Amino acid sequence: SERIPNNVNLNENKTLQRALEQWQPSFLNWWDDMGPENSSNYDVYLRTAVSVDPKGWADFGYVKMHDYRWGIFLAPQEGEKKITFGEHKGQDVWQEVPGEYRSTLRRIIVTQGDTEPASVEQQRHLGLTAPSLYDLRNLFQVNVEEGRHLWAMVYLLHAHFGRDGREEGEALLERRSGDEDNPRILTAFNEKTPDWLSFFMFTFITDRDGKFQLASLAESAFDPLARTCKFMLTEEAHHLFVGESGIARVIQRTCEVMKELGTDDPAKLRAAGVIDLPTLQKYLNFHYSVTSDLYGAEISSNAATYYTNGLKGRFEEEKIGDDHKLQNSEYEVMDVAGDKILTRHVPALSALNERLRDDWITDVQAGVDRWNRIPAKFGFDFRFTLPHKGFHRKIGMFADVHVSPDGRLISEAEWTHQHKNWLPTESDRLYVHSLMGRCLEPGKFANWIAAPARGINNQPVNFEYVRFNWS
């Protein structure tokens, strides 16, 4: 082992190596303060990336999380990679950041960076109510990887953004989720993640915004960014898995109990300590709509310049069958006109945020379809659905207006009186919270969630995924 593991020959740039070694103790201070509560002396069975070979790239073993081997890993550098979109299509990719784009790319990197520790800060208390050792370990695995994502971006800042990059790396540790004076940059990352149902939805829906922002940055003309993100997407895949199967196992458990009691009635299901499917639907509505705001205004001149200038491409840019310049292309978006929601066509360049939002909607929907297999398998009519994209939005054309899940423009009064049916109430949040009792004995699961289909790294489900050191 080296002090900072990496596949970018950090060793051979002494100035850069020392700058990051200077930042490391500060990162570790942040981990000890805002990382998982009371965990400094736990041994956790964790995956650690040591390399990038797709055949095997990650060690498994017990480690105390303070000692986790956070490292910098980029996808391998391609020979003569060309810029695939925008005014610079056809030219060589960039190894350094051009002056004209320096501050724009900095803000992109910093904003992506900021969401990483924000997630850990939002989730630091969750361990104390973990429904199983398996689940606690998953939480911790997500947490250390979000840590590594902070390292991924701070590396770029130090390596390619000089003085202010150094300053940005500091400031990334000084802002704090929900803080009054130094809050994190985006609204979704200052929200409470108050329980494990929210956590699974977060990693299912909001980490998915991560997926799509990263996939777009993975196309970037700025190739060190591109390569950082390509790898990060592999990590994000694990986070989405935790979320999707989290909720699946909760739905499984609720369905088991609906069959077992021969009933549908929320009151009865809640007497038995499960989360009724309609309440789950409200949580889906909440996280979905709040996350949708992160993609930005549907129509936006800034997104257009990030494409044209080669900074940020579309999701799976190279598969799309067009000119990859888009000056003469169109895209269909919605439009609020009077008391009706219509559609119209706009220049493709101005609707890139909406395209990426639409791509993310599709991906979330495929997951909702998979969840719906469960009640179908039980012969139940219940289906999860996604609300109309304008529902419960604070960013974009729907910001100053209200839309029901089924896509009706509704008055302020209707919203006030009906939204208790569509988003979690205090009562619903208190009920879900009341089920959150920790359960730490090997192979056992809190009554509100089912056992997973399998373990981790081929260990059995009743493996001792976390040792606390009493035993």
Ligand SMILES: [Cl-]
């Ligand atoms: Cl109104």
Ligand SMILES: [Fe+3]
């Ligand atoms: Fe991340």
Ligand SMILES: [Fe+3]
């Ligand atoms: Fe993530």
Ligand SMILES: [O-]
């Ligand atoms: O992530």
